[PDB]
Symmetry: C3
Subunit: 126 residues, 3 copies
């Protein structure tokens, strides 16, 4: 039951107390992505649309680096800064996954790290 650290050069860098994802026993446990662009270290934009798209892109990068894929995602958890953003977020999430339909839980947090508007974590299979 080895743990393998996942570090994509495309996803936001993990330089603190966490890894982008950990592989263990055939599963990939992904950190909660926020909508940072690795190229800038800043949010992709100020809007929910911009950050949501970036979050889903980031997740894909992490999953690919792990040897997984969006289609191998079993469960996500979707955190919003503001519940009114649910509809917009959900559309962008759905585009990202296409016809694949993970299990899901969603909620509005009181606040997210770094003032993010959206954070999405997941678990996937190899």
């Amino acid at each position: 039951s080895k743990l393998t650290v996942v570090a994509s050069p495309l996803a936001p860098e993990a330089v603190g107390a966490y890894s982008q994802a950990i592989i263990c026993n055939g599963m990939v446990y992904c950190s909660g992505q926020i909508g940072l662009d690795r190229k800038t270290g800043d949010f992709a934009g100020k809007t929910i649309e911009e950050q949501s798209k970036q979050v889903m892109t980031n997740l894909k990068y992490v999953l690919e680096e792990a040897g997984s894929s969006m289609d191998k995602v079993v469960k996500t958890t979707c955190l919003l800064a503001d519940i009114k953003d649910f509809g917009v977020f959900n559309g962008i999430y759905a585009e990202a996954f296409g016809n694949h339909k993970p299990a899901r839980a969603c909620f509005a947090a009181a606040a997210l790290p770094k003032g993010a508007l959206v954070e999405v974590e997941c678990i996937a299979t190899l």
Copy 2:
């Protein structure tokens, strides 16, 4: 590591970007149930008691459809719209599980989808 979609006709319908649950590698990953009654597509009631009972019933339906059970639940996460609802919720949760005692985390969200008062997700074994 096939994924199997769980769709009970008894639990709220999943007609959007998620599945009620996903089976993978011997485990069942359940979406966060809210207190909708599949027969109406509406909340079972306006109160915490009514919605909490519905949520736990819904979870049982999903688990059964997956080939699992309440007694096979390993971990839940219990989300409340209002922290003051913890005691009432907890009683209803406990009734639902009987002597089975999953691992658990609970918190109050700033808000939940659809204005729900309570949302409960879980992971279970086959």
Copy 3:
């Protein structure tokens, strides 16, 4: 796929509808620890620093009882009562894990059980 209940005498007692952790299929699913001291049944202190240290100590006790360890943690979820506590919390978390870097998601809840300032759950391997 037997479930085993984990009950450390060092971690806060689980006397209600949950277990400290559940072992299943080679993995340990840990409840969200709050900063209670088992010796008193009360918070270790009123501050974020005091409770955060207690939470990480509690997690270690649970993991050890399960046959796991801090180094075997694959993923955590870190819940704060107040987003401004993120930096302090993160330092204490990092001390606790040393060079081990789980996957992670963090957020501020609207509120936590018992008025806690911080709650941390995790999943680990045997």
